Each structure stands twice: as structure tokens, then as C-alpha cells.
Design a protein around this ligand. Structure first.
Ligand SMILES: O=C(O)[C@H]1O[C@H](O[C@@H]2[C@H](O)[C@@H](O)[C@H](O)O[C@@H]2C(=O)O)[C@H](O)[C@@H](O)[C@H]1O
Length: 138
């Protein structure tokens, strides 16, 4: 396993056709998971499954600029389950990040941060056992 929180460097940032794959297992009684694609201190893409927000499960996505969070985008399709292994694939496309979980499309998030080649770290945190984090150009 990998130690959480985990930092995955993204050398030279991201670019369309870059596929980032995160493998892990959600802990029992999980509350949250976060994948934070960072441009320095800014968070270009916060992908944030929440397991118990007012007794609902929801995926929250957002961006943080100059330490301020923006307007969330929410997705109630929720493919994670406490205790179960998952695969998150984030495919950078020209206008959005495209996310699939366990080989099923989940959501897209349009690029708010434009300097893709400066989004040079992925932070992985929350209630998981992290098995691997890697990327490949497809
Ligand atoms: O303080 C809040 O209102 C929230 O703080 C966390 O959420 C932050 C951020 O405020 C939010 O815009 C973003 O989408 O997700 C962030 C995060 O850390 O996940 C709490 O998670 C949230 O429940 C609110 O309390």
C-alpha cells in the first residue's frame, strides 16, 4: 500500500490524452475521499466523494483559486461502497476532466484552470487504503 495522504507528481502538468489511474479500497464506515489536482496552491479539480452528507452520498467537484473555493458541481450517481475496492480513472480531455469509476463513466468537469501544464500534483486523501497511483499517455 501507499501512505495516505499521498502526493503523485504530474511532471509538466496534465495534457489531453493523459490518463491518471487510482486504485484503492474504501475503508469501512468511510466519510470522504478527495483527489485534488493542484496548480501550486490552487486546486484545479477537487473530486470529492462524500458518504454521509445529510445522510446522502454525493460526489462533489470544485476548484480552489487564491485559497477560495468556487461553485460546486454535484453528482448523485455514487459508485463507491464502503469496504470495496475501486478504480478511479481521470482522463484529461481538451475541455474537461472525464472520470470513470470501475470502468463506468461517472462525470465530466470542465476546465476552470486553463494552464493544464501547471497542474503538476495530485493529492489523494481520505478514507481509503491506497494501492497505486499512476498515469499513462493514451
Ligand atoms: O466549510 C464548508 O462549507 C465546507 O468545507 C469542506 O468543503 C470544502 C469546500 O468548502 C467546498 O467548497 C469544496 O467543494 O470541498 C472542500 C472539501 O474539503 O471537501 C467540507 O467538506 C464541507 O462539508 C463544508 O463544511
Amino acid at each position: 500500500p501507499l501512505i495516505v495522504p499521498y502526493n503523485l507528481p504530474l511532471p509538466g502538468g496534465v495534457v489531453p490524452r493523459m490518463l491518471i489511474t487510482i486504485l484503492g479500497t474504501v475503508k469501512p464506515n468511510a466519510n470522504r475521499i478527495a483527489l485534488d489536482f493542484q496548480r501550486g496552491n490552487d486546486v484545479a479539480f477537487h473530486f470529492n466523494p462524500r458518504f454521509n452528507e445529510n445522510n446522502r452520498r454525493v460526489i462533489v467537484c470544485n476548484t480552489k483559486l487564491d485559497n477560495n473555493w468556487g461553485r460546486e458541481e454535484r453528482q448523485s450517481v455514487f459508485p463507491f461502497e464502503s469496504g470495496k475496492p475501486f478504480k478511479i480513472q481521470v482522463l484529461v480531455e481538451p475541455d474537461h476532466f472525464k472520470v470513470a469509476v470501475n470502468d463506468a463513466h461517472l462525470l465530466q468537469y470542465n476546465h476552470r484552470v486553463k494552464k493544464l501544464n501547471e497542474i503538476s500534483k495530485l493529492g489523494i486523501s481520505g478514507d481509503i487504503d491506497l494501492t497505486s497511483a499512476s498515469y499513462t499517455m493514451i
